[PDB]
Structure formats: C-alpha cells, structure tokens
C-alpha cells in the first residue's frame, strides 16, 4: 500500500493477542504503545520526546502484526498519548518514504532553509505540525502549547513562513520551541508530495 499524509497514517496491529490502532511514525526510533497487558519479563526504561521523558516497560522479542505483515522486536509500553510504530518495525515491513526514496534504517533527515538559515530536520509522519528548536524568525507570532511523548511544551506559532525542504518550497505555519529535534510534520510533508510505501 501507498499512504499519503493528509491524514494521520494509522494502521491496525495485532500484538499480545489484542487489536490496536497505531501511528506509522518515521520520527520515532522505537515503537511505543499505551499501557497494555503483554506476556513475560520486562526492563524499566526511560525514553524522551517533546515535553520530556516518560518511564516505560521494555519487552523484547514481541510478535507484532502490522497491517498484513509480521515482525518481531522490542516494544515499549507506557504513558504515551498515542500508539506509535517506530523505525525499528517500519524497516521490518519494508516501509519507505517517497517525495527521492528513503528507507528507514536511519533517521530520515533533510536539510531545510528557513528564515534565511540552514538547519537539519527529521521527516516525521507522526507529527501533525512542524516544530523547530529555538531560532530567530521574521515577524509576529502567537503563544501556543503542543503535546507529545513526555507532556506539553510552550511554542511560538509563526504563520506564513517560507520553508525550502530538500529541493522543494512550501509555505505554512511553523512552531518554535523547546523540541529536542527539528521536526517536519504532515502539514509540510503533504506540500512536498511525501508518501509512505509498504
């Protein structure tokens, strides 16, 4: 299947004998699920994201069926607001990002130019919105809060900002704040014709 990004790329998964919906998230290194019952031993673990860190239980060698496809790997379980399938499992089902084609064995980074400056950013299908680390942008903005793995952060919303991502230009809203990494969300991914293919 090919998947465009005008809506969140959700899929049905079967794990631990249970059915769940999860977000195909190219911006996630690891797969993280909301609290659920899984068989066996686990290890305590802390993972970070927008908003900070959360404690999760790490289960190893867990069978997961994602769409029609099987994979076995590590699964983290904890207080994430959304079930996310990260690159660890995307690679196993042969997922690629197309806009150039990109496999997901490494973080899908691209060079962007915004506000006259050059930055590197993560192509993040799991992000509704584009969020950049603190930077100098031209003009007026509005105070805003956005949520994520470890809670919420306050960001400045700038409207009508030109961004050039890889080759391609796009205009839209950009959030600026204490995100750990620059993220290109679906708002801009759709403008450069990005798709998920598996």
UniProtKB/Swiss-Prot annotation:
Dimerization of protease as annotated region, ranges: 1-104, 49-154, 88-198
Ranges of residues in domain Peptidase A2: 20-188
Active-site residues, as the UniProt record annotates them: 25, 124 (for protease activity)
Site (Cleavage): 1, 99-100, 198
Top-level taxon in the UniProt lineage: Viruses
Assembly and interaction partners: Homodimer, whose active site consists of two apposed aspartic acid residues.
Task of the protein: Aspartyl protease that mediates proteolytic cleavages of Gag and Gag-Pol polyproteins during or shortly after the release of the virion from the plasma membrane. Cleavages take place as an ordered, step-wise cascade to yield mature proteins. This process is called maturation. Displays maximal activity during the budding process just prior to particle release from the cell. Also cleaves Nef and Vif, probably concomitantly with viral structural proteins on maturation of virus particles. Hydrolyzes host EIF4GI and PABP1 in order to shut off the capped cellular mRNA translation.
Name listed for the protein in its UniProt record: Protease
Gene: gag-pol
């Amino acid at each position: 299947p090919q998947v465009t990004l005008w809506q969140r790329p959700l899929v049905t998964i079967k794990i631990g004998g249970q059915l769940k919906e999860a977000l195909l998230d190219t911006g996630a290194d690891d797969t993280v699920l909301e609290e659920m019952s899984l068989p066996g031993r686990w290890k305590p673990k802390m993972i970070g994201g927008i908003g900070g860190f959360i404690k999760v239980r790490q289960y190893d060698q867990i069978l997961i069926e994602i769409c029609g496809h099987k994979a076995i790997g590590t699964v983290l379980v904890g207080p994430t607001p959304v079930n996310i399938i990260g690159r660890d499992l995307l690679t196993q089902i042969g997922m690629t990002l197309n806009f150039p084609q990109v496999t997901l064995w490494q973080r899908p980074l691209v060079t962007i130019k915004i506000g006259g400056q050059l930055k590197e950013a993560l192509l993040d299908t799991g992000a509704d919105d584009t969020v950049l680390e603190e930077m100098s942008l031209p003009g007026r903005w509005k105070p805003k809060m956005i949520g994520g793995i470890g809670g919420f952060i306050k960001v400045r919303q700038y409207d009508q900002i030109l961004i050039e991502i890889c080759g391609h230009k796009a205009i839209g809203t950009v959030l600026v704040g204490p995100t750990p990494v620059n993220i290109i969300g679906r708002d801009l991914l759709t403008q450069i014709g990005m798709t998920l293919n598996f």
